[PDB]
From a paper:
Tripartite motif (TRIM)7 is an E3 ubiquitin ligase that was first identified through its interaction with glycogenin-1 (GN1), the autoglucosyltransferase that initiates glycogen biosynthesis. Human [name] is a 511-amino acid protein that displays the canonical TRIM/RBCC motif followed by a [name].2 C-terminal domain. TRIM7B30.2 structure reveals the typical [name].2 domain fold consisting of two antiparallel β-sheets of seven (β1, β2, β4, β9, β10, β11, and β13) and six (β3, β5, β6, β7, β8, and β12) strands, arranged as a distorted β-sandwich. The [name]/GNIP1–glycogenin interaction was shown to be mediated by the [name].2 domain, whereas the CC domain was involved in the protein self-association.
To contribute to the understanding of the mechanism of action of [name], we solved the X-ray crystal structure of its [name].2 domain (TRIM7B30.2) in two crystal forms at resolutions of 1.6 Å and 1.8 Å. Even though the packing of the molecules in the two crystal forms is different, the structure of the four independent molecules is very similar, showing backbone root mean square deviations (RMSD) smaller than 0.5 Å for all pairwise comparisons. Despite its high structural and sequence similarity, unlike BTN3A1B30.2, which would be able to form dimers, TRIM7B30.2 is monomeric both in solution on the basis of gel filtration chromatography and in the crystals, according to the quaternary assembly analysis with the PISA server. During the refinement process, electron density that fitted well to a malonate ion from the crystallization solution was observed in a positively charged cavity found on one side of the pocket, in all four TRIM7B30.2 molecules from both crystal forms. Malonate is in the same position in three of the four molecules (chain A from the 1.6 Å resolution structure and both chains in the 1.8 Å resolution structure) hydrogen-bonded to Thr384, Arg385 and Ser499. The most external carboxylate of malonate also forms a bidentate salt bridge with the guanidinium group of Arg487 from a symmetry-related protein molecule. Furthermore, despite almost certainly being a nonnatural ligand of TRIM7B30.2, malonate binding reveals the existence of a potential binding site for negatively charged regions of such partners. During the refinement process, additional electron densities connected to Cys378, Cys390, and Cys501 were observed in the Fobs-Fcalc map in both crystal forms. As the TRIM7B30.2 crystal structure showed, the β-mercaptoethanol included in the purification and crystallization to prevent precipitation at a high concentration, reacted with three of its four cysteines without significantly affecting the structure as revealed by CD analysis.
Author numbering: 339 to 511
The structure:
Amino acid sequence: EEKVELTLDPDTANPRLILSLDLKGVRLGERAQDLPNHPCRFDTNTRVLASCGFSSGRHHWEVEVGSKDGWAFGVARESVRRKGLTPFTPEEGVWALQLNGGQYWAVTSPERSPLSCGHLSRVRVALDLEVGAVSFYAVEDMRHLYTFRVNFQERVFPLFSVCSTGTYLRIWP
């Protein structure tokens, strides 16, 4: 329910990321940029949020994914830690799919869950704050990939992480 028009929040972006000027695309750069030290900025983890956070309702958006390893995306609670090295786990307030070692995974803790979904090109993220779910679909055939069940009780932001050079995420279109 309700396609949303998202832009990456440049006050959150870790200084090693390269954002697109239209605030849709993100990759990892070779060096930290000299960005201003905003309190909301991830100073260590390779993360950026969208500027829009959701308190209720059902929302969906699409993410164009690179073929090469080194990305994760989904949603984060607003209280996700910004300063210091924070584990990438549901307990630390991130719910995401990742591509690592040529395999797709739901980032569950304490063990990640391997998916057998085959090659991904674009992924729909559906957030339902009434039901308490974030779900991922392959856009081709809208095949269900994975749903995290969470009793979300703070604002939820779209989350992107790129931890290797040579891959990318882009909010589509």
